[PDB]
Design a protein around this ligand. Structure first.
Ligand SMILES: Nc1ncnc2c1ncn2[C@@H]1O[C@H](COP(=O)(O)OP(=O)(O)O)[C@@H](O)[C@H]1O
Length: 261
């Protein structure tokens, strides 16, 4: 019962499918004489409510296992390829996941296509039990999917003038309403364009550029990756953040993430 919920929360398992996909073994053990369909649902619902309402990205991004060799880690490599001190960069990511940098609550992965921006952002978003994506096709409710999430991934679309203030709040980690409210949540933006551009009808303005970049850490990934590089895996995310935690260095609260030690 409640022993199972503790486990689901620890493992970040929100659905029976996931539970089976990730640990088919424990699912069969647990259910063995019987498959209480109600007990299962209750545990999952409870675990999910506990995770979405009170847990944070770090609980799932930071791997539980030691990372002896981080050099093989795709995230580490991508950062390295572009001139970033992976240890310093990891600290930015670590502090970012832990809402350590005040208004700088957003990591912006900028760069031309095939640089690994989506590879990283999506791996991270899929590592946490609950993540939301900013939906610009829905001009009315662009953040509907961003409630009670551990990571918000802004993958596409431009910010509209009608939501810029809300956007600044979310990107800046300040609670804001969208009926339903978005508590501070680490945002990761991936784009090949200046997403600080704001659309107001026929007008495109950069007047909100400074406010916007005051809430971001910007990484510039320009090194096109070989089609062979591979997808950053959930485990790689875990190892990367665990490694970051075990080797954290001081980070400067600056828009541009420096390129060096
Ligand atoms: N699902 C995936 N499976 C295998 N490799 C992937 C996957 N997604 C990304 N990659 C790798 O990452 C590189 C960059 O693609 P992403 O799609 O990461 O790039 P972008 O920077 O344009 O968002 C590709 O060259 C590819 O090798």
């Amino acid at each position: 019962g409640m022993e199972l919920v503790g486990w689901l929360v620890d493992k970040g398992i929100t659905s029976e499918k996931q539970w089976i996909q990730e640990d088919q073994a424990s699912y069969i053990s647990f259910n063995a004489a019987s498959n209480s369909r109600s007990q299962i649902k209750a545990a999952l619902d409870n675990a999910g409510k506990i995770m979405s309402l009170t847990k944070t990205a770090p609980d799932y991004l930071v791997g539980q296992q030691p990372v002896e060799d981080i050099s093989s880690n795709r995230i580490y490599k991508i950062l390295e390829l572009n001139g970033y001190d992976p240890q310093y960069a990891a600290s930015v990511f670590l502090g970012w996941a832990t809402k350590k940098f005040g208004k700088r609550n957003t990591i912006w992965l900028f760069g031309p296509a095939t640089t690994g921006k989506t590879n990283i952002a999506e791996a991270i978003a899929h590592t946490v039990p609950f993540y939301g994506c900013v939906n610009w096709t829905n001009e009315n409710f662009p953040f509907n999917d961003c409630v009670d999430k551990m990571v918000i991934w802004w993958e596409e679309g431009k910010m509209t003038a009608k939501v810029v203030e809300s956007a600044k709040a979310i990107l800046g980690g300040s609670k804001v309403r969208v009926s339903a409210q978005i508590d501070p949540t680490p945002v990761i933006v991936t784009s090949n364009t200046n997403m600080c551009a704001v659309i107001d009808g026929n007008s495109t303005t950069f007047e909100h550029q400074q406010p916007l970049q005051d809430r971001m850490f910007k990484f510039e990934l320009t090194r096109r990756l070989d089609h062979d590089f591979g997808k950053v895996t959930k485990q790689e995310v875990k190892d990367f953040f665990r490694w970051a935690k075990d080797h954290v260095v001081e980070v400067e609260h600056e828009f541009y993430v420096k390129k060096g030690g």
